[PDB]
Amino acid sequence: DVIKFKEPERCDYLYVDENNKVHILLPIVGGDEIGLDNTCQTAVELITFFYGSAHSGVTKYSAEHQLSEYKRQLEEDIKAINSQKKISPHAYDDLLKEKIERLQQIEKYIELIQVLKKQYDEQNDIRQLRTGGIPQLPSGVKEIIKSSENAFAVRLSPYDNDKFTRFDDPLFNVKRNISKYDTPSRQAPIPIYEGLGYRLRSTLFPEDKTPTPINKKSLRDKVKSTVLSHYKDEKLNELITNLQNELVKELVKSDPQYSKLSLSKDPRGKEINYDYLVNSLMLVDNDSEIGDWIDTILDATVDSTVWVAQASSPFYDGAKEISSDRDADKISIRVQYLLAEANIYCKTNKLSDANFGEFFDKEPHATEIAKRVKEGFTQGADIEPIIYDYINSNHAELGLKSPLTGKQQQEITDKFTKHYNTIKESPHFDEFFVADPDKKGNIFSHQGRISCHFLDFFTRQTKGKHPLGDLASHQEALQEGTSNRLHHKNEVVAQGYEKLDQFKKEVVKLLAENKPKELLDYLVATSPTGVPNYSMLSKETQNYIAYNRNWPAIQKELEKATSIPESQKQDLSRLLSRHDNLSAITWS
Ligand SMILES: [Ba+2]
Ligand SMILES: [Ba+2]
Ligand SMILES: [Ba+2]
């Protein structure tokens, strides 16, 4: 007497597009744009996909399990709809068609998984997810990644590196030490004394263990220092002019509207002179230092809201100096990842096909860039533009036809900051998989996973020896979408239910306005597939209409009608007259 529809608007690995085509997304790693799984744990999503897993206090079921649950739910819904066709033959014909299409596709997908595991795993390429100590990505996935146009792996040189990298075709790549795991005792790496990593680490905190100072100055202090750099009545004017120039010069970078800023007068129009600053405001005297003059002029002319600081860089985390090998390692890895991010930006934007690591590992670049970064930290300067200026000085040799513009540099900085803040607590920094779901490619973003199309992998893994049948065009159908960011739920499923509610509202509306002819007209109106609207009748709407002040009028109108087939007239007389009770319907 009540029907709850079970098919949910969300399922793991399941994406249903606007044309009711079912796509199953095979996960590579967790993440949105940058992969959260690295080294040993790289395989944990594919393990979960194929066999389920239980870790980190969470229990995750296989795709086959989840899709079978889904199927079962669809079958319940279908059975529930067909029970109503015993009362009204047309009941929910469109919702039913859609559900059956989905069901059929899902059954085919479950078949494909089953036969993949059973019949096309002679080399145990997939079983090894279950049995191998530290699993490899299966070959098909490696092929997808290697041939990918919007996702790329980058591999770095942390001092204490891990040999268990799992992305074998990195775009960005630098020389590394010999992992401790390649030694008997498994405690410490065998160092190499060349390459980018070594020069960074060894320049930032050297063998004599002399610390590198980090003098991160604010906007205010940057200006005050730069201005005081020129020092040991007109003097006051020169001071104020140079000061204003530097201040506005620095301020117009975040907001051009600071162009109109003046330090020559106070807010009330009073002029900044000796008598005012020494005798009205008593903040300075004849023998006061210049810093105090600057401070006072600033205090006199600008309000506090000007000194709000810009977003911080990953390179400046609040330490006053690089005082250990570990700090040098951290900074080294940040610089490396910045370069990697540049490299990725250039690959995806078709500016270069080169590997920047190959370049920056060579001398004298490895030494020079480390030198400049150290100086930069010591001078309190922005680290990213150093790297950018060095790249631009060598853009030809890095495969770039032209230098990186300010816009592109800033975009790189934004991506680097965003991504690096996401992974900064990672146990291992050896490699990262970075995807761009805003660009054409075979890698997607769906439900917190960086994925590929399952049929892509299936075709690649079975080598085309198993026909896809009805699913032969889905891979290409998903590529036709405007984005590789797939919504986490399936609107096409929800709209199925929304249409029923819309029916209810329309019925209630046409009843309230006391129009019987239009209500009948509405009930017998067809969808684009030729299905009468009254196929969406349920207990609620049946009762709304049957028990209404207007029903006798609708009945007379229904008797008069000549355009309606007798079967539908009979359905309506039977369902709306006062044995033949439709169930109530609801959903999740
Ligand atoms: Ba003046
Ligand atoms: Ba596309
Ligand atoms: Ba009845």
UniProtKB/TrEMBL annotation:
Domain SidC N-terminal: 3-494
Domain of life of the source: Bacteria
Protein name listed in UniProt: SidC, interaptin
Organism ancestry: Bacteria, Pseudomonadati, Pseudomonadota, Gammaproteobacteria, Legionellales
Covered range of the whole protein: 7 to 608 of 917
